[PDB]
Amino acid sequence: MNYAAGLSPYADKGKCGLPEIFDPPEELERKVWELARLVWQSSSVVFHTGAGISTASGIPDFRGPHGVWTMEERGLAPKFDTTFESARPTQTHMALVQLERVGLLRFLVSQNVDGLHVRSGFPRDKLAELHGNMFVEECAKCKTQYVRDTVVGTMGLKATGRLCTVAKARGLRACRGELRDTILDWEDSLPDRDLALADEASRNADLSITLGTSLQIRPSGNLPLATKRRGGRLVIVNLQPTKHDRHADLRIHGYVDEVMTRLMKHLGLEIPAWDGPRVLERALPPLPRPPTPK
């Protein structure tokens, strides 16, 4: 049904529709408290997010019980409560903006194309959008990018119809390259610089925490393992199983909004309210850490 967007029909959709698992309240309470300890005691924390952190906004995931691939695989279409334009950042989106402001998040690697991290105000220089961003187009000639307020209008790295305006020939001519969407199709190369930065942050983290991804798509799904190579720790947060459950130092099965609400509570940090779509290109210097909670 996605083709349509003229996307490849030859993808391997992975394991779709596995049962959800829910930790009982007491265990969960225990786990989120342990998470806070890890986040406070680690000096370099990298988060990795997937489609599961945008479900509370009305965007479906891919392989959940009602995921877009899960439904397709069984001959059904999925259902969209919201458009990408009208989607609102969730409490988890807003929590990550705050973590970064206070220095508790070194970097954020996302697989999501819904544009919400950017639109929530998350600074672009701490973010790798490894699979693209429905609001971003890019010059085929010169790689310069343009962030738009509306979706760019194609997927699969196709010409959007606009042209590049960067200055060429010592100021005499415009680039005029075709702008293209940045939505990777199946088996496209990841963007070099986002991957190189995501890889660097993952290899250097001493804590990687995954949120709302079943980790089945590489290489983004393999980045949280890099941390374990230097003896850092891995935390997986997800309702379904994930491909790398056996490497987790801490596994939490619960709703991300609920997990991040509590985490912030233990950390002493309010979750900012969202004003509306606001692009921040570069991080501010860090606000000071809150009073040591433990």
Partner: peptide
């Protein structure tokens, strides 16, 4: 070394 394409597979 090893590919940087969006797909399903190992990390080794």
């Amino acid at each position: 070394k090893q590919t940087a394409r969006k797909s399903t597979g190992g990390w080794w």
